[PDB]
Write a protein that binds this ligand. Structure first.
Ligand SMILES: Nc1nc2c(ncn2[C@@H]2O[C@H](CO)[C@H](O)[C@H]2OP(=O)(O)OC[C@H]2O[C@H](n3cnc4c(N)ncnc43)[C@H](O)[C@H]2O)c(=O)[nH]1
Length: 203
Protein backbone atom coordinates (compact mmCIF):
# COMPACT_ATOMS: atom_id res chain seq x y z
CA UNK A 1 0.00 0.00 0.00
CA UNK A 2 1.13 3.55 -0.77
CA UNK A 3 1.98 5.63 2.29
CA UNK A 4 1.31 9.33 2.88
CA UNK A 5 4.78 10.32 1.67
CA UNK A 6 4.63 7.93 -1.29
CA UNK A 7 1.30 9.42 -2.39
CA UNK A 8 2.78 12.90 -1.98
CA UNK A 9 5.84 11.86 -4.00
CA UNK A 10 3.54 10.67 -6.80
CA UNK A 11 2.01 14.15 -6.87
CA UNK A 12 5.53 15.56 -7.30
CA UNK A 13 6.33 13.19 -10.18
CA UNK A 14 3.10 14.11 -11.97
CA UNK A 15 3.61 17.85 -11.51
CA UNK A 16 7.27 17.54 -12.52
CA UNK A 17 6.28 15.95 -15.83
CA UNK A 18 3.60 18.61 -16.38
CA UNK A 19 5.99 21.52 -15.77
CA UNK A 20 8.78 19.86 -17.77
CA UNK A 21 9.28 21.65 -21.09
CA UNK A 22 12.07 22.16 -23.63
CA UNK A 23 13.66 18.72 -23.36
CA UNK A 24 15.75 16.65 -25.77
CA UNK A 25 15.01 13.11 -26.94
CA UNK A 26 17.78 10.50 -26.84
CA UNK A 27 16.27 7.88 -29.14
CA UNK A 28 17.01 5.68 -32.13
CA UNK A 29 15.31 6.50 -35.42
CA UNK A 30 13.88 3.30 -36.93
CA UNK A 31 12.00 2.13 -40.02
CA UNK A 32 8.58 0.55 -39.44
CA UNK A 33 6.71 -1.75 -41.86
CA UNK A 34 3.30 -0.17 -41.18
CA UNK A 35 1.87 2.88 -42.94
CA UNK A 36 -0.66 5.61 -42.21
CA UNK A 37 -3.22 3.99 -44.53
CA UNK A 38 -3.03 0.78 -42.48
CA UNK A 39 -4.97 2.64 -39.75
CA UNK A 40 -7.48 4.34 -42.06
CA UNK A 41 -10.45 2.85 -40.18
CA UNK A 42 -9.10 4.12 -36.83
CA UNK A 43 -9.95 7.47 -35.26
CA UNK A 44 -6.92 9.12 -33.65
CA UNK A 45 -6.55 11.60 -30.79
CA UNK A 46 -4.56 14.72 -31.70
CA UNK A 47 -4.16 17.40 -29.02
CA UNK A 48 -3.44 19.96 -31.75
CA UNK A 49 -7.08 19.55 -32.82
CA UNK A 50 -8.59 19.24 -29.32
CA UNK A 51 -9.95 21.74 -26.81
CA UNK A 52 -9.46 22.13 -23.08
CA UNK A 53 -5.71 21.49 -23.11
CA UNK A 54 -4.25 23.55 -20.27
CA UNK A 55 -0.61 23.59 -21.48
CA UNK A 56 0.17 22.65 -25.08
CA UNK A 57 3.91 23.04 -24.37
CA UNK A 58 3.99 20.42 -21.60
CA UNK A 59 5.72 17.22 -22.72
CA UNK A 60 2.90 15.23 -21.08
CA UNK A 61 0.47 16.20 -23.89
CA UNK A 62 2.66 17.89 -26.50
CA UNK A 63 3.50 14.71 -28.43
CA UNK A 64 -0.01 13.20 -28.38
CA UNK A 65 -0.49 13.92 -32.07
CA UNK A 66 -2.63 11.04 -33.33
CA UNK A 67 -0.63 8.73 -35.57
CA UNK A 68 1.55 11.61 -36.84
CA UNK A 69 4.51 10.24 -34.89
CA UNK A 70 8.10 9.82 -36.15
CA UNK A 71 9.16 6.16 -36.10
CA UNK A 72 11.66 5.99 -33.25
CA UNK A 73 12.59 4.04 -30.12
CA UNK A 74 13.11 6.30 -27.11
CA UNK A 75 16.07 5.43 -24.89
CA UNK A 76 15.78 8.35 -22.49
CA UNK A 77 14.48 11.88 -21.99
CA UNK A 78 16.69 14.47 -20.28
CA UNK A 79 16.83 18.23 -19.83
CA UNK A 80 18.09 20.82 -22.30
CA UNK A 81 21.26 21.61 -20.32
CA UNK A 82 22.45 18.03 -21.00
CA UNK A 83 22.69 18.58 -24.77
CA UNK A 84 26.48 18.94 -24.60
CA UNK A 85 26.75 15.60 -22.80
CA UNK A 86 24.52 13.93 -25.40
CA UNK A 87 26.57 15.38 -28.26
CA UNK A 88 29.72 14.15 -26.51
CA UNK A 89 28.19 10.68 -26.15
CA UNK A 90 27.36 10.53 -29.86
CA UNK A 91 31.02 11.30 -30.58
CA UNK A 92 32.22 8.72 -28.04
CA UNK A 93 30.10 6.13 -29.90
CA UNK A 94 31.24 7.18 -33.38
CA UNK A 95 32.68 3.72 -34.12
CA UNK A 96 29.41 1.96 -33.24
CA UNK A 97 27.35 0.98 -36.29
CA UNK A 98 23.83 1.93 -35.22
CA UNK A 99 22.46 0.43 -38.45
CA UNK A 100 23.46 -3.03 -37.20
CA UNK A 101 21.14 -2.63 -34.20
CA UNK A 102 17.77 -4.32 -34.57
CA UNK A 103 14.50 -4.70 -32.67
CA UNK A 104 11.74 -7.31 -32.82
CA UNK A 105 8.04 -6.46 -32.62
CA UNK A 106 6.64 -8.58 -29.80
CA UNK A 107 3.28 -7.37 -28.46
CA UNK A 108 0.93 -4.44 -29.02
CA UNK A 109 0.34 -2.56 -25.77
CA UNK A 110 -2.06 0.30 -25.04
CA UNK A 111 -0.36 2.20 -22.23
CA UNK A 112 -2.61 3.43 -19.40
CA UNK A 113 -3.71 7.05 -19.51
CA UNK A 114 -1.09 9.09 -17.66
CA UNK A 115 -2.50 11.21 -14.85
CA UNK A 116 -0.26 14.10 -15.95
CA UNK A 117 -1.95 14.30 -19.36
CA UNK A 118 -5.46 13.78 -17.97
CA UNK A 119 -5.05 16.70 -15.56
CA UNK A 120 -3.95 18.91 -18.47
CA UNK A 121 -7.19 18.16 -20.35
CA UNK A 122 -5.98 15.28 -22.52
CA UNK A 123 -8.19 12.28 -23.29
CA UNK A 124 -5.83 9.93 -25.10
CA UNK A 125 -3.94 6.69 -24.55
CA UNK A 126 -0.78 5.57 -26.33
CA UNK A 127 -0.97 2.40 -28.44
CA UNK A 128 2.60 1.17 -28.87
CA UNK A 129 4.42 -1.89 -30.19
CA UNK A 130 6.56 -3.44 -27.46
CA UNK A 131 9.97 -4.48 -28.78
CA UNK A 132 12.58 -7.05 -27.80
CA UNK A 133 15.86 -5.15 -27.52
CA UNK A 134 19.21 -6.89 -27.88
CA UNK A 135 22.06 -6.69 -25.39
CA UNK A 136 23.79 -4.13 -27.61
CA UNK A 137 20.83 -1.75 -27.32
CA UNK A 138 20.48 -2.34 -23.57
CA UNK A 139 24.20 -1.74 -23.05
CA UNK A 140 24.06 1.37 -25.24
CA UNK A 141 21.23 2.77 -23.10
CA UNK A 142 22.97 2.00 -19.80
CA UNK A 143 26.23 3.65 -20.87
CA UNK A 144 24.13 6.55 -22.19
CA UNK A 145 22.71 7.08 -18.70
CA UNK A 146 26.24 6.79 -17.27
CA UNK A 147 27.59 9.55 -19.54
CA UNK A 148 24.45 11.71 -19.86
CA UNK A 149 22.48 12.30 -16.62
CA UNK A 150 18.90 11.27 -17.37
CA UNK A 151 15.82 11.54 -15.12
CA UNK A 152 14.61 8.24 -13.69
CA UNK A 153 11.52 6.91 -15.45
CA UNK A 154 8.68 6.71 -12.90
CA UNK A 155 5.54 5.65 -14.79
CA UNK A 156 4.02 3.65 -11.92
CA UNK A 157 4.39 3.64 -8.14
CA UNK A 158 7.32 5.68 -6.86
CA UNK A 159 8.59 2.67 -4.89
CA UNK A 160 8.77 0.36 -7.92
CA UNK A 161 12.01 0.17 -9.87
CA UNK A 162 11.73 1.27 -13.52
CA UNK A 163 11.36 -1.49 -16.11
CA UNK A 164 12.37 -0.21 -19.54
CA UNK A 165 9.70 -1.02 -22.13
CA UNK A 166 11.37 -0.46 -25.52
CA UNK A 167 8.60 0.39 -27.95
CA UNK A 168 7.57 2.27 -31.08
CA UNK A 169 4.51 4.41 -30.46
CA UNK A 170 2.09 3.86 -33.35
CA UNK A 171 -0.63 6.34 -32.42
CA UNK A 172 -2.85 7.87 -29.76
CA UNK A 173 -6.57 7.11 -29.49
CA UNK A 174 -9.33 8.33 -27.20
CA UNK A 175 -9.49 6.68 -23.78
CA UNK A 176 -13.31 6.45 -23.90
CA UNK A 177 -13.70 4.45 -27.13
CA UNK A 178 -13.04 0.75 -26.57
CA UNK A 179 -14.23 -0.39 -30.01
CA UNK A 180 -11.82 1.98 -31.77
CA UNK A 181 -9.03 0.93 -29.40
CA UNK A 182 -9.62 -2.82 -29.82
CA UNK A 183 -9.80 -2.49 -33.61
CA UNK A 184 -6.56 -0.49 -33.65
CA UNK A 185 -4.79 -3.10 -31.51
CA UNK A 186 -6.05 -5.97 -33.68
CA UNK A 187 -4.78 -4.27 -36.85
CA UNK A 188 -1.45 -3.42 -35.21
CA UNK A 189 -1.02 -7.01 -33.98
CA UNK A 190 -0.66 -8.17 -37.60
CA UNK A 191 2.86 -6.66 -37.59
CA UNK A 192 4.08 -8.71 -34.62
CA UNK A 193 7.36 -10.48 -35.32
CA UNK A 194 8.51 -7.84 -37.82
CA UNK A 195 12.20 -6.99 -37.51
CA UNK A 196 12.89 -3.26 -37.14
CA UNK A 197 16.16 -1.73 -38.36
CA UNK A 198 17.74 1.31 -36.70
CA UNK A 199 18.97 4.12 -38.95
CA UNK A 200 20.63 6.36 -36.35
CA UNK A 201 19.98 8.92 -33.64
CA UNK A 202 16.87 11.08 -33.66
CA UNK A 203 17.44 14.67 -34.77
N1 LIG B 1 2.25 3.79 -19.05
C1 LIG B 1 3.60 3.87 -19.61
N2 LIG B 1 3.91 4.89 -20.63
C2 LIG B 1 5.28 4.98 -21.21
C3 LIG B 1 6.27 4.10 -20.78
N3 LIG B 1 7.38 4.42 -21.47
C4 LIG B 1 7.10 5.43 -22.27
N4 LIG B 1 5.83 5.79 -22.12
C5 LIG B 1 5.18 6.88 -22.86
O1 LIG B 1 5.08 7.40 -21.41
C6 LIG B 1 4.22 8.39 -21.50
C7 LIG B 1 3.47 8.59 -20.16
O2 LIG B 1 3.80 9.87 -19.67
C8 LIG B 1 3.16 7.98 -22.69
O3 LIG B 1 2.04 7.32 -22.12
C9 LIG B 1 3.80 7.23 -23.54
O4 LIG B 1 3.97 7.90 -24.74
P1 LIG B 1 5.33 7.69 -25.68
O5 LIG B 1 5.93 6.34 -25.36
O6 LIG B 1 4.89 7.75 -27.14
O7 LIG B 1 6.39 8.92 -25.37
C10 LIG B 1 6.12 10.25 -25.80
C11 LIG B 1 7.11 10.65 -26.92
O8 LIG B 1 7.55 12.12 -26.71
C12 LIG B 1 8.81 12.01 -25.83
N5 LIG B 1 9.28 12.93 -26.88
C13 LIG B 1 9.00 12.89 -28.18
N6 LIG B 1 9.63 13.88 -28.81
C14 LIG B 1 10.35 14.55 -27.89
C15 LIG B 1 11.21 15.67 -27.93
N7 LIG B 1 11.48 16.35 -29.20
N8 LIG B 1 11.78 16.10 -26.80
C16 LIG B 1 11.54 15.48 -25.65
N9 LIG B 1 10.74 14.43 -25.57
C17 LIG B 1 10.13 13.95 -26.67
C18 LIG B 1 8.90 10.71 -25.53
O9 LIG B 1 10.24 10.32 -25.38
C19 LIG B 1 8.27 10.00 -26.81
O10 LIG B 1 8.13 8.60 -26.65
C20 LIG B 1 5.95 3.04 -19.72
O11 LIG B 1 6.80 2.29 -19.36
N10 LIG B 1 4.63 2.95 -19.16
Amino acid sequence: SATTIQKELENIVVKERQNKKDTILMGLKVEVPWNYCDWASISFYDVRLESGILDMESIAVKYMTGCDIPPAVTLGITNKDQEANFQRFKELTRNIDLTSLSFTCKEVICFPQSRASKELGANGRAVVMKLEASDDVKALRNVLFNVVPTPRDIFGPVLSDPVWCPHVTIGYVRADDEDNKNSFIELAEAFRGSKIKVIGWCE
